[PDB]
Amino acid sequence: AQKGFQDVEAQAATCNHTVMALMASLDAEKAQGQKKVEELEGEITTLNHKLQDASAEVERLRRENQVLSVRIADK
Amino acid sequence: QELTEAQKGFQDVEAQAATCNHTVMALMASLDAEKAQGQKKVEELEGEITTLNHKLQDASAEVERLRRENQVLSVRIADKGT
Ligand SMILES: *[C@@H]1O[C@H](CO)[C@@H](O)[C@H](O)[C@H]1NC(C)=O
Ligand SMILES: *[C@@H]1O[C@H](CO)[C@@H](O)[C@H](O)[C@H]1NC(C)=O
């Protein structure tokens, strides 16, 4: 049954390698996931800034136009 | 007496391999789980960015509309200048 011990010990070595491999994997996947999410975050941010610029121009115009209308009124 | 040493060493090495097998199993579980999560979060982000784009567009439209509305009003105010 000692031969059995040898075969099993070996089986355990193999398994350990596989586990290490998976681990490297998971860690890697987490890294990738993290960076993609980071890209999207940044695109959402700049996206936002451009939307602020937009709404600002808008409110500004609404104001300048309201004013014009009023000026026309008193005329 | 080595025989006993090998019954033991064997027993713990057996148990050990079993532990690793469950271990790997759990690792795959966790890996696919992580993929899932990843794809999910990104879908969310995508939907978010799309929405950002439509709102931004609508904004730009609105701005132009108001510049025209403006050029009109301005011409009236110039008419009054007479
Ligand atoms: C499992 O893998 C690690 C990392 O190489 C190794 O150092 C350790 O001895 C292994 N464990 C067993 C019980 O074989
Ligand atoms: C461990 O898992 C492998 C692959 O499924 C299997 O072939 C092997 O017999 C298992 N070992 C033990 C100790 O259960």
PDB file of N, CA, C and O in Angstrom, chain B:
ATOM      1  N   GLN B   1       9.457  -0.729  11.430  1.00  0.00           N
ATOM      2  CA  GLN B   1       8.689   0.352  12.122  1.00  0.00           C
ATOM      3  C   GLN B   1       8.346   1.503  11.180  1.00  0.00           C
ATOM      4  O   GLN B   1       7.464   2.318  11.450  1.00  0.00           O
ATOM      5  N   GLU B   2       9.070   1.564  10.074  1.00  0.00           N
ATOM      6  CA  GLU B   2       8.763   2.530   9.000  1.00  0.00           C
ATOM      7  C   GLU B   2       7.333   2.322   8.487  1.00  0.00           C
ATOM      8  O   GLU B   2       6.688   3.264   8.035  1.00  0.00           O
ATOM      9  N   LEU B   3       6.864   1.080   8.576  1.00  0.00           N
ATOM     10  CA  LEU B   3       5.513   0.681   8.092  1.00  0.00           C
ATOM     11  C   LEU B   3       4.405   1.549   8.711  1.00  0.00           C
ATOM     12  O   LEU B   3       3.486   2.026   8.031  1.00  0.00           O
ATOM     13  N   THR B   4       4.535   1.751  10.012  1.00  0.00           N
ATOM     14  CA  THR B   4       3.575   2.564  10.783  1.00  0.00           C
ATOM     15  C   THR B   4       3.650   4.016  10.333  1.00  0.00           C
ATOM     16  O   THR B   4       2.637   4.664  10.073  1.00  0.00           O
ATOM     17  N   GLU B   5       4.886   4.488  10.231  1.00  0.00           N
ATOM     18  CA  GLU B   5       5.209   5.853   9.757  1.00  0.00           C
ATOM     19  C   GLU B   5       4.560   6.156   8.398  1.00  0.00           C
ATOM     20  O   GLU B   5       4.228   7.307   8.075  1.00  0.00           O
ATOM     21  N   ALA B   6       4.383   5.096   7.625  1.00  0.00           N
ATOM     22  CA  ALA B   6       3.834   5.200   6.269  1.00  0.00           C
ATOM     23  C   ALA B   6       2.310   5.094   6.242  1.00  0.00           C
ATOM     24  O   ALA B   6       1.652   5.626   5.353  1.00  0.00           O
ATOM     25  N   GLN B   7       1.767   4.393   7.220  1.00  0.00           N
ATOM     26  CA  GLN B   7       0.299   4.345   7.414  1.00  0.00           C
ATOM     27  C   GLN B   7      -0.212   5.734   7.803  1.00  0.00           C
ATOM     28  O   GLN B   7      -1.236   6.224   7.307  1.00  0.00           O
ATOM     29  N   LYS B   8       0.539   6.345   8.708  1.00  0.00           N
ATOM     30  CA  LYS B   8       0.262   7.717   9.192  1.00  0.00           C
ATOM     31  C   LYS B   8       0.474   8.744   8.093  1.00  0.00           C
ATOM     32  O   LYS B   8      -0.475   9.377   7.622  1.00  0.00           O
ATOM     33  N   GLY B   9       1.730   8.897   7.693  1.00  0.00           N
ATOM     34  CA  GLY B   9       2.111   9.829   6.606  1.00  0.00           C
ATOM     35  C   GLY B   9       1.150   9.722   5.426  1.00  0.00           C
ATOM     36  O   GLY B   9       0.762  10.712   4.796  1.00  0.00           O
ATOM     37  N   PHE B  10       0.752   8.495   5.149  1.00  0.00           N
ATOM     38  CA  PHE B  10      -0.227   8.252   4.093  1.00  0.00           C
ATOM     39  C   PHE B  10      -1.592   8.805   4.411  1.00  0.00           C
ATOM     40  O   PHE B  10      -2.277   9.311   3.533  1.00  0.00           O
ATOM     41  N   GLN B  11      -2.005   8.626   5.655  1.00  0.00           N
ATOM     42  CA  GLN B  11      -3.343   9.060   6.087  1.00  0.00           C
ATOM     43  C   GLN B  11      -3.491  10.583   5.966  1.00  0.00           C
ATOM     44  O   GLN B  11      -4.497  11.114   5.476  1.00  0.00           O
ATOM     45  N   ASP B  12      -2.476  11.279   6.439  1.00  0.00           N
ATOM     46  CA  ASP B  12      -2.507  12.752   6.415  1.00  0.00           C
ATOM     47  C   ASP B  12      -2.325  13.310   4.996  1.00  0.00           C
ATOM     48  O   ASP B  12      -2.806  14.389   4.680  1.00  0.00           O
ATOM     49  N   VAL B  13      -1.629  12.562   4.158  1.00  0.00           N
ATOM     50  CA  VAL B  13      -1.403  12.984   2.756  1.00  0.00           C
ATOM     51  C   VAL B  13      -2.660  12.779   1.918  1.00  0.00           C
ATOM     52  O   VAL B  13      -2.943  13.527   0.991  1.00  0.00           O
ATOM     53  N   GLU B  14      -3.388  11.737   2.271  1.00  0.00           N
ATOM     54  CA  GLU B  14      -4.707  11.445   1.697  1.00  0.00           C
ATOM     55  C   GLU B  14      -5.661  12.582   2.024  1.00  0.00           C
ATOM     56  O   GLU B  14      -6.233  13.232   1.145  1.00  0.00           O
ATOM     57  N   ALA B  15      -5.828  12.793   3.322  1.00  0.00           N
ATOM     58  CA  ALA B  15      -6.703  13.857   3.816  1.00  0.00           C
ATOM     59  C   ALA B  15      -6.351  15.156   3.100  1.00  0.00           C
ATOM     60  O   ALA B  15      -7.221  15.851   2.589  1.00  0.00           O
ATOM     61  N   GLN B  16      -5.053  15.424   3.041  1.00  0.00           N
ATOM     62  CA  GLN B  16      -4.501  16.650   2.425  1.00  0.00           C
ATOM     63  C   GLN B  16      -4.961  16.832   0.995  1.00  0.00           C
ATOM     64  O   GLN B  16      -5.410  17.902   0.592  1.00  0.00           O
ATOM     65  N   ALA B  17      -4.837  15.783   0.207  1.00  0.00           N
ATOM     66  CA  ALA B  17      -5.223  15.900  -1.205  1.00  0.00           C
ATOM     67  C   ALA B  17      -6.699  16.283  -1.278  1.00  0.00           C
ATOM     68  O   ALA B  17      -7.102  17.119  -2.075  1.00  0.00           O
ATOM     69  N   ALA B  18      -7.487  15.678  -0.400  1.00  0.00           N
ATOM     70  CA  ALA B  18      -8.927  15.932  -0.383  1.00  0.00           C
ATOM     71  C   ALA B  18      -9.184  17.400  -0.123  1.00  0.00           C
ATOM     72  O   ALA B  18     -10.051  18.018  -0.737  1.00  0.00           O
ATOM     73  N   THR B  19      -8.410  17.957   0.792  1.00  0.00           N
ATOM     74  CA  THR B  19      -8.557  19.370   1.158  1.00  0.00           C
ATOM     75  C   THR B  19      -8.304  20.250  -0.038  1.00  0.00           C
ATOM     76  O   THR B  19      -9.039  21.190  -0.310  1.00  0.00           O
ATOM     77  N   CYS B  20      -7.249  19.921  -0.752  1.00  0.00           N
ATOM     78  CA  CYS B  20      -6.893  20.688  -1.936  1.00  0.00           C
ATOM     79  C   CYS B  20      -7.990  20.602  -3.005  1.00  0.00           C
ATOM     80  O   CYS B  20      -8.318  21.572  -3.665  1.00  0.00           O
ATOM     81  N   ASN B  21      -8.576  19.431  -3.147  1.00  0.00           N
ATOM     82  CA  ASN B  21      -9.638  19.247  -4.159  1.00  0.00           C
ATOM     83  C   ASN B  21     -10.818  20.164  -3.903  1.00  0.00           C
ATOM     84  O   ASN B  21     -11.331  20.820  -4.807  1.00  0.00           O
ATOM     85  N   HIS B  22     -11.224  20.227  -2.649  1.00  0.00           N
ATOM     86  CA  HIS B  22     -12.314  21.144  -2.268  1.00  0.00           C
ATOM     87  C   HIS B  22     -11.850  22.570  -2.527  1.00  0.00           C
ATOM     88  O   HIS B  22     -12.571  23.419  -3.026  1.00  0.00           O
ATOM     89  N   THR B  23     -10.598  22.789  -2.181  1.00  0.00           N
ATOM     90  CA  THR B  23      -9.939  24.100  -2.347  1.00  0.00           C
ATOM     91  C   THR B  23     -10.006  24.650  -3.771  1.00  0.00           C
ATOM     92  O   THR B  23     -10.468  25.748  -4.019  1.00  0.00           O
ATOM     93  N   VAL B  24      -9.511  23.865  -4.699  1.00  0.00           N
ATOM     94  CA  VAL B  24      -9.652  24.185  -6.122  1.00  0.00           C
ATOM     95  C   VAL B  24     -11.116  24.432  -6.469  1.00  0.00           C
ATOM     96  O   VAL B  24     -11.450  25.433  -7.098  1.00  0.00           O
ATOM     97  N   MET B  25     -11.980  23.516  -6.048  1.00  0.00           N
ATOM     98  CA  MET B  25     -13.424  23.624  -6.382  1.00  0.00           C
ATOM     99  C   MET B  25     -13.918  25.028  -6.019  1.00  0.00           C
ATOM    100  O   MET B  25     -14.554  25.745  -6.812  1.00  0.00           O
ATOM    101  N   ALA B  26     -13.570  25.424  -4.807  1.00  0.00           N
ATOM    102  CA  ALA B  26     -13.979  26.740  -4.278  1.00  0.00           C
ATOM    103  C   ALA B  26     -13.392  27.891  -5.082  1.00  0.00           C
ATOM    104  O   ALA B  26     -14.005  28.930  -5.267  1.00  0.00           O
ATOM    105  N   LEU B  27     -12.194  27.664  -5.575  1.00  0.00           N
ATOM    106  CA  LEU B  27     -11.470  28.673  -6.357  1.00  0.00           C
ATOM    107  C   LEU B  27     -12.140  28.967  -7.683  1.00  0.00           C
ATOM    108  O   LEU B  27     -12.227  30.103  -8.109  1.00  0.00           O
ATOM    109  N   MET B  28     -12.577  27.908  -8.336  1.00  0.00           N
ATOM    110  CA  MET B  28     -13.323  28.029  -9.605  1.00  0.00           C
ATOM    111  C   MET B  28     -14.622  28.755  -9.317  1.00  0.00           C
ATOM    112  O   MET B  28     -14.974  29.720  -9.983  1.00  0.00           O
ATOM    113  N   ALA B  29     -15.315  28.279  -8.290  1.00  0.00           N
ATOM    114  CA  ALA B  29     -16.552  28.933  -7.828  1.00  0.00           C
ATOM    115  C   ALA B  29     -16.346  30.448  -7.741  1.00  0.00           C
ATOM    116  O   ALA B  29     -17.094  31.250  -8.323  1.00  0.00           O
ATOM    117  N   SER B  30     -15.291  30.812  -7.036  1.00  0.00           N
ATOM    118  CA  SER B  30     -14.963  32.219  -6.777  1.00  0.00           C
ATOM    119  C   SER B  30     -14.557  33.008  -8.018  1.00  0.00           C
ATOM    120  O   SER B  30     -14.775  34.205  -8.126  1.00  0.00           O
ATOM    121  N   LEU B  31     -13.945  32.310  -8.937  1.00  0.00           N
ATOM    122  CA  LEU B  31     -13.457  32.911 -10.176  1.00  0.00           C
ATOM    123  C   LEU B  31     -14.634  33.289 -11.094  1.00  0.00           C
ATOM    124  O   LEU B  31     -14.755  34.422 -11.548  1.00  0.00           O
ATOM    125  N   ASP B  32     -15.504  32.320 -11.334  1.00  0.00           N
ATOM    126  CA  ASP B  32     -16.734  32.530 -12.135  1.00  0.00           C
ATOM    127  C   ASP B  32     -17.624  33.570 -11.501  1.00  0.00           C
ATOM    128  O   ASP B  32     -18.288  34.355 -12.183  1.00  0.00           O
ATOM    129  N   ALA B  33     -17.645  33.536 -10.180  1.00  0.00           N
ATOM    130  CA  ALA B  33     -18.380  34.536  -9.400  1.00  0.00           C
ATOM    131  C   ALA B  33     -17.853  35.930  -9.717  1.00  0.00           C
ATOM    132  O   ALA B  33     -18.611  36.866  -9.959  1.00  0.00           O
ATOM    133  N   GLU B  34     -16.534  36.039  -9.732  1.00  0.00           N
ATOM    134  CA  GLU B  34     -15.854  37.327  -9.979  1.00  0.00           C
ATOM    135  C   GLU B  34     -16.128  37.829 -11.391  1.00  0.00           C
ATOM    136  O   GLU B  34     -16.285  39.007 -11.640  1.00  0.00           O
ATOM    137  N   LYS B  35     -16.173  36.907 -12.314  1.00  0.00           N
ATOM    138  CA  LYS B  35     -16.471  37.255 -13.708  1.00  0.00           C
ATOM    139  C   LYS B  35     -17.863  37.852 -13.785  1.00  0.00           C
ATOM    140  O   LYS B  35     -18.078  38.916 -14.346  1.00  0.00           O
ATOM    141  N   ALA B  36     -18.798  37.113 -13.213  1.00  0.00           N
ATOM    142  CA  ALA B  36     -20.204  37.533 -13.137  1.00  0.00           C
ATOM    143  C   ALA B  36     -20.278  38.967 -12.643  1.00  0.00           C
ATOM    144  O   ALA B  36     -20.762  39.868 -13.316  1.00  0.00           O
ATOM    145  N   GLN B  37     -19.752  39.153 -11.452  1.00  0.00           N
ATOM    146  CA  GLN B  37     -19.779  40.451 -10.778  1.00  0.00           C
ATOM    147  C   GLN B  37     -19.260  41.527 -11.713  1.00  0.00           C
ATOM    148  O   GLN B  37     -19.869  42.572 -11.879  1.00  0.00           O
ATOM    149  N   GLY B  38     -18.129  41.226 -12.327  1.00  0.00           N
ATOM    150  CA  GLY B  38     -17.410  42.154 -13.227  1.00  0.00           C
ATOM    151  C   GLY B  38     -18.321  42.601 -14.348  1.00  0.00           C
ATOM    152  O   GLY B  38     -18.583  43.791 -14.530  1.00  0.00           O
ATOM    153  N   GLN B  39     -18.834  41.621 -15.071  1.00  0.00           N
ATOM    154  CA  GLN B  39     -19.733  41.889 -16.202  1.00  0.00           C
ATOM    155  C   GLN B  39     -20.939  42.711 -15.750  1.00  0.00           C
ATOM    156  O   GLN B  39     -21.361  43.632 -16.426  1.00  0.00           O
ATOM    157  N   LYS B  40     -21.463  42.368 -14.584  1.00  0.00           N
ATOM    158  CA  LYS B  40     -22.640  43.050 -14.030  1.00  0.00           C
ATOM    159  C   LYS B  40     -22.349  44.523 -13.830  1.00  0.00           C
ATOM    160  O   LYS B  40     -23.059  45.379 -14.347  1.00  0.00           O
ATOM    161  N   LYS B  41     -21.288  44.802 -13.089  1.00  0.00           N
ATOM    162  CA  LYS B  41     -20.900  46.198 -12.784  1.00  0.00           C
ATOM    163  C   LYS B  41     -20.703  46.980 -14.071  1.00  0.00           C
ATOM    164  O   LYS B  41     -21.145  48.100 -14.224  1.00  0.00           O
ATOM    165  N   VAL B  42     -20.059  46.352 -15.020  1.00  0.00           N
ATOM    166  CA  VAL B  42     -19.796  47.042 -16.266  1.00  0.00           C
ATOM    167  C   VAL B  42     -21.087  47.338 -17.049  1.00  0.00           C
ATOM    168  O   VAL B  42     -21.235  48.407 -17.624  1.00  0.00           O
ATOM    169  N   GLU B  43     -22.018  46.398 -17.058  1.00  0.00           N
ATOM    170  CA  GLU B  43     -23.338  46.642 -17.682  1.00  0.00           C
ATOM    171  C   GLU B  43     -23.965  47.900 -17.090  1.00  0.00           C
ATOM    172  O   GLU B  43     -24.541  48.746 -17.777  1.00  0.00           O
ATOM    173  N   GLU B  44     -23.849  47.974 -15.781  1.00  0.00           N
ATOM    174  CA  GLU B  44     -24.417  49.088 -15.025  1.00  0.00           C
ATOM    175  C   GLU B  44     -23.826  50.385 -15.528  1.00  0.00           C
ATOM    176  O   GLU B  44     -24.537  51.346 -15.821  1.00  0.00           O
ATOM    177  N   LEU B  45     -22.507  50.359 -15.633  1.00  0.00           N
ATOM    178  CA  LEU B  45     -21.703  51.523 -16.056  1.00  0.00           C
ATOM    179  C   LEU B  45     -22.081  51.962 -17.451  1.00  0.00           C
ATOM    180  O   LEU B  45     -22.259  53.138 -17.738  1.00  0.00           O
ATOM    181  N   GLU B  46     -22.188  50.981 -18.313  1.00  0.00           N
ATOM    182  CA  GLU B  46     -22.589  51.212 -19.685  1.00  0.00           C
ATOM    183  C   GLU B  46     -23.926  51.961 -19.753  1.00  0.00           C
ATOM    184  O   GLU B  46     -24.038  52.995 -20.395  1.00  0.00           O
ATOM    185  N   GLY B  47     -24.933  51.416 -19.079  1.00  0.00           N
ATOM    186  CA  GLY B  47     -26.284  52.035 -19.021  1.00  0.00           C
ATOM    187  C   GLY B  47     -26.198  53.463 -18.523  1.00  0.00           C
ATOM    188  O   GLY B  47     -26.876  54.358 -19.012  1.00  0.00           O
ATOM    189  N   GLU B  48     -25.330  53.653 -17.545  1.00  0.00           N
ATOM    190  CA  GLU B  48     -25.061  54.982 -16.969  1.00  0.00           C
ATOM    191  C   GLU B  48     -24.501  55.959 -18.001  1.00  0.00           C
ATOM    192  O   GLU B  48     -24.886  57.109 -18.075  1.00  0.00           O
ATOM    193  N   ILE B  49     -23.577  55.471 -18.789  1.00  0.00           N
ATOM    194  CA  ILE B  49     -22.835  56.310 -19.738  1.00  0.00           C
ATOM    195  C   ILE B  49     -23.714  56.675 -20.918  1.00  0.00           C
ATOM    196  O   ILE B  49     -23.659  57.775 -21.453  1.00  0.00           O
ATOM    197  N   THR B  50     -24.513  55.712 -21.320  1.00  0.00           N
ATOM    198  CA  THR B  50     -25.523  55.919 -22.361  1.00  0.00           C
ATOM    199  C   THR B  50     -26.418  57.056 -21.947  1.00  0.00           C
ATOM    200  O   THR B  50     -26.541  58.043 -22.658  1.00  0.00           O
ATOM    201  N   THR B  51     -27.023  56.902 -20.773  1.00  0.00           N
ATOM    202  CA  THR B  51     -27.914  57.941 -20.208  1.00  0.00           C
ATOM    203  C   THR B  51     -27.223  59.318 -20.173  1.00  0.00           C
ATOM    204  O   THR B  51     -27.788  60.337 -20.567  1.00  0.00           O
ATOM    205  N   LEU B  52     -25.984  59.327 -19.724  1.00  0.00           N
ATOM    206  CA  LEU B  52     -25.169  60.563 -19.725  1.00  0.00           C
ATOM    207  C   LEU B  52     -25.105  61.200 -21.123  1.00  0.00           C
ATOM    208  O   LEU B  52     -25.099  62.416 -21.293  1.00  0.00           O
ATOM    209  N   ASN B  53     -25.061  60.344 -22.118  1.00  0.00           N
ATOM    210  CA  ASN B  53     -24.920  60.789 -23.498  1.00  0.00           C
ATOM    211  C   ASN B  53     -26.199  61.393 -24.018  1.00  0.00           C
ATOM    212  O   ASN B  53     -26.179  62.376 -24.733  1.00  0.00           O
ATOM    213  N   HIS B  54     -27.315  60.800 -23.639  1.00  0.00           N
ATOM    214  CA  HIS B  54     -28.612  61.281 -24.122  1.00  0.00           C
ATOM    215  C   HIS B  54     -28.941  62.610 -23.468  1.00  0.00           C
ATOM    216  O   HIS B  54     -29.493  63.497 -24.091  1.00  0.00           O
ATOM    217  N   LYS B  55     -28.537  62.745 -22.223  1.00  0.00           N
ATOM    218  CA  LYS B  55     -28.832  63.968 -21.450  1.00  0.00           C
ATOM    219  C   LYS B  55     -27.971  65.107 -21.954  1.00  0.00           C
ATOM    220  O   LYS B  55     -28.374  66.262 -22.037  1.00  0.00           O
ATOM    221  N   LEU B  56     -26.765  64.733 -22.300  1.00  0.00           N
ATOM    222  CA  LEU B  56     -25.791  65.685 -22.823  1.00  0.00           C
ATOM    223  C   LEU B  56     -26.249  66.196 -24.182  1.00  0.00           C
ATOM    224  O   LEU B  56     -26.191  67.388 -24.474  1.00  0.00           O
ATOM    225  N   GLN B  57     -26.686  65.265 -25.008  1.00  0.00           N
ATOM    226  CA  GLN B  57     -27.211  65.599 -26.339  1.00  0.00           C
ATOM    227  C   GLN B  57     -28.385  66.569 -26.219  1.00  0.00           C
ATOM    228  O   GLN B  57     -28.366  67.668 -26.762  1.00  0.00           O
ATOM    229  N   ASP B  58     -29.395  66.141 -25.483  1.00  0.00           N
ATOM    230  CA  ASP B  58     -30.592  66.966 -25.226  1.00  0.00           C
ATOM    231  C   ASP B  58     -30.210  68.378 -24.795  1.00  0.00           C
ATOM    232  O   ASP B  58     -30.809  69.367 -25.204  1.00  0.00           O
ATOM    233  N   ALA B  59     -29.184  68.439 -23.972  1.00  0.00           N
ATOM    234  CA  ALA B  59     -28.631  69.719 -23.516  1.00  0.00           C
ATOM    235  C   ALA B  59     -28.150  70.558 -24.690  1.00  0.00           C
ATOM    236  O   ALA B  59     -28.508  71.717 -24.808  1.00  0.00           O
ATOM    237  N   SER B  60     -27.355  69.953 -25.555  1.00  0.00           N
ATOM    238  CA  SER B  60     -26.718  70.682 -26.676  1.00  0.00           C
ATOM    239  C   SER B  60     -27.740  71.218 -27.658  1.00  0.00           C
ATOM    240  O   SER B  60     -27.626  72.344 -28.171  1.00  0.00           O
ATOM    241  N   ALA B  61     -28.725  70.369 -27.921  1.00  0.00           N
ATOM    242  CA  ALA B  61     -29.930  70.752 -28.683  1.00  0.00           C
ATOM    243  C   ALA B  61     -30.492  72.030 -28.094  1.00  0.00           C
ATOM    244  O   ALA B  61     -30.534  73.083 -28.736  1.00  0.00           O
ATOM    245  N   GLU B  62     -30.894  71.903 -26.837  1.00  0.00           N
ATOM    246  CA  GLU B  62     -31.519  73.010 -26.082  1.00  0.00           C
ATOM    247  C   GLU B  62     -30.758  74.320 -26.224  1.00  0.00           C
ATOM    248  O   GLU B  62     -31.352  75.384 -26.424  1.00  0.00           O
ATOM    249  N   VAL B  63     -29.443  74.211 -26.133  1.00  0.00           N
ATOM    250  CA  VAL B  63     -28.553  75.384 -26.246  1.00  0.00           C
ATOM    251  C   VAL B  63     -28.701  76.068 -27.586  1.00  0.00           C
ATOM    252  O   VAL B  63     -28.910  77.267 -27.668  1.00  0.00           O
ATOM    253  N   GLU B  64     -28.593  75.287 -28.635  1.00  0.00           N
ATOM    254  CA  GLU B  64     -28.756  75.849 -29.988  1.00  0.00           C
ATOM    255  C   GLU B  64     -30.121  76.539 -30.111  1.00  0.00           C
ATOM    256  O   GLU B  64     -30.212  77.718 -30.443  1.00  0.00           O
ATOM    257  N   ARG B  65     -31.166  75.797 -29.777  1.00  0.00           N
ATOM    258  CA  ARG B  65     -32.555  76.323 -29.780  1.00  0.00           C
ATOM    259  C   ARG B  65     -32.630  77.711 -29.134  1.00  0.00           C
ATOM    260  O   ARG B  65     -33.332  78.632 -29.581  1.00  0.00           O
ATOM    261  N   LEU B  66     -31.898  77.840 -28.059  1.00  0.00           N
ATOM    262  CA  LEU B  66     -31.920  79.095 -27.304  1.00  0.00           C
ATOM    263  C   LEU B  66     -31.070  80.203 -27.925  1.00  0.00           C
ATOM    264  O   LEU B  66     -31.324  81.376 -27.722  1.00  0.00           O
ATOM    265  N   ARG B  67     -30.061  79.823 -28.679  1.00  0.00           N
ATOM    266  CA  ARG B  67     -29.250  80.810 -29.374  1.00  0.00           C
ATOM    267  C   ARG B  67     -30.059  81.416 -30.487  1.00  0.00           C
ATOM    268  O   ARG B  67     -29.937  82.596 -30.771  1.00  0.00           O
ATOM    269  N   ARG B  68     -30.889  80.603 -31.111  1.00  0.00           N
ATOM    270  CA  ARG B  68     -31.746  81.121 -32.186  1.00  0.00           C
ATOM    271  C   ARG B  68     -32.815  82.041 -31.571  1.00  0.00           C
ATOM    272  O   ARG B  68     -32.975  83.222 -31.940  1.00  0.00           O
ATOM    273  N   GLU B  69     -33.524  81.478 -30.604  1.00  0.00           N
ATOM    274  CA  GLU B  69     -34.583  82.209 -29.893  1.00  0.00           C
ATOM    275  C   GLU B  69     -34.012  83.567 -29.538  1.00  0.00           C
ATOM    276  O   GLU B  69     -34.668  84.599 -29.589  1.00  0.00           O
ATOM    277  N   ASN B  70     -32.746  83.527 -29.190  1.00  0.00           N
ATOM    278  CA  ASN B  70     -32.004  84.722 -28.790  1.00  0.00           C
ATOM    279  C   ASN B  70     -31.805  85.700 -29.943  1.00  0.00           C
ATOM    280  O   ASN B  70     -32.089  86.883 -29.802  1.00  0.00           O
ATOM    281  N   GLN B  71     -31.321  85.204 -31.075  1.00  0.00           N
ATOM    282  CA  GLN B  71     -31.025  86.085 -32.234  1.00  0.00           C
ATOM    283  C   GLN B  71     -32.262  86.849 -32.667  1.00  0.00           C
ATOM    284  O   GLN B  71     -32.203  88.039 -32.977  1.00  0.00           O
ATOM    285  N   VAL B  72     -33.385  86.146 -32.639  1.00  0.00           N
ATOM    286  CA  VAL B  72     -34.723  86.772 -32.815  1.00  0.00           C
ATOM    287  C   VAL B  72     -35.020  87.926 -31.826  1.00  0.00           C
ATOM    288  O   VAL B  72     -35.268  89.074 -32.204  1.00  0.00           O
ATOM    289  N   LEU B  73     -35.002  87.599 -30.551  1.00  0.00           N
ATOM    290  CA  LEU B  73     -35.266  88.602 -29.521  1.00  0.00           C
ATOM    291  C   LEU B  73     -34.377  89.834 -29.716  1.00  0.00           C
ATOM    292  O   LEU B  73     -34.811  90.979 -29.598  1.00  0.00           O
ATOM    293  N   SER B  74     -33.127  89.560 -30.047  1.00  0.00           N
ATOM    294  CA  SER B  74     -32.098  90.605 -30.221  1.00  0.00           C
ATOM    295  C   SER B  74     -32.473  91.550 -31.349  1.00  0.00           C
ATOM    296  O   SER B  74     -32.370  92.768 -31.227  1.00  0.00           O
ATOM    297  N   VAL B  75     -32.920  90.963 -32.447  1.00  0.00           N
ATOM    298  CA  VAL B  75     -33.379  91.753 -33.609  1.00  0.00           C
ATOM    299  C   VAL B  75     -34.540  92.656 -33.231  1.00  0.00           C
ATOM    300  O   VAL B  75     -34.584  93.802 -33.636  1.00  0.00           O
ATOM    301  N   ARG B  76     -35.476  92.133 -32.454  1.00  0.00           N
ATOM    302  CA  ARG B  76     -36.571  92.988 -31.930  1.00  0.00           C
ATOM    303  C   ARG B  76     -36.050  94.191 -31.129  1.00  0.00           C
ATOM    304  O   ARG B  76     -36.450  95.336 -31.341  1.00  0.00           O
ATOM    305  N   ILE B  77     -35.139  93.910 -30.218  1.00  0.00           N
ATOM    306  CA  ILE B  77     -34.555  94.950 -29.349  1.00  0.00           C
ATOM    307  C   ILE B  77     -33.787  96.011 -30.147  1.00  0.00           C
ATOM    308  O   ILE B  77     -33.673  97.159 -29.736  1.00  0.00           O
ATOM    309  N   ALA B  78     -33.256  95.596 -31.284  1.00  0.00           N
ATOM    310  CA  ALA B  78     -32.602  96.515 -32.214  1.00  0.00           C
ATOM    311  C   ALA B  78     -33.647  97.382 -32.924  1.00  0.00           C
ATOM    312  O   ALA B  78     -33.431  98.573 -33.126  1.00  0.00           O
ATOM    313  N   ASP B  79     -34.774  96.775 -33.292  1.00  0.00           N
ATOM    314  CA  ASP B  79     -35.918  97.510 -33.902  1.00  0.00           C
ATOM    315  C   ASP B  79     -36.361  98.664 -33.032  1.00  0.00           C
ATOM    316  O   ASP B  79     -36.669  99.754 -33.509  1.00  0.00           O
ATOM    317  N   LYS B  80     -36.400  98.392 -31.739  1.00  0.00           N
ATOM    318  CA  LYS B  80     -36.797  99.409 -30.739  1.00  0.00           C
ATOM    319  C   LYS B  80     -35.811 100.581 -30.722  1.00  0.00           C
ATOM    320  O   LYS B  80     -36.176 101.715 -30.422  1.00  0.00           O
ATOM    321  N   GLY B  81     -34.570 100.276 -31.090  1.00  0.00           N
ATOM    322  CA  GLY B  81     -33.469 101.264 -31.167  1.00  0.00           C
ATOM    323  C   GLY B  81     -33.785 102.465 -32.042  1.00  0.00           C
ATOM    324  O   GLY B  81     -33.137 103.506 -31.930  1.00  0.00           O
ATOM    325  N   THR B  82     -34.789 102.317 -32.903  1.00  0.00           N
ATOM    326  CA  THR B  82     -35.233 103.411 -33.798  1.00  0.00           C
ATOM    327  C   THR B  82     -36.118 104.423 -33.055  1.00  0.00           C
ATOM    328  O   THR B  82     -37.270 104.139 -32.711  1.00  0.00           O
TER     329      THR B  82
END
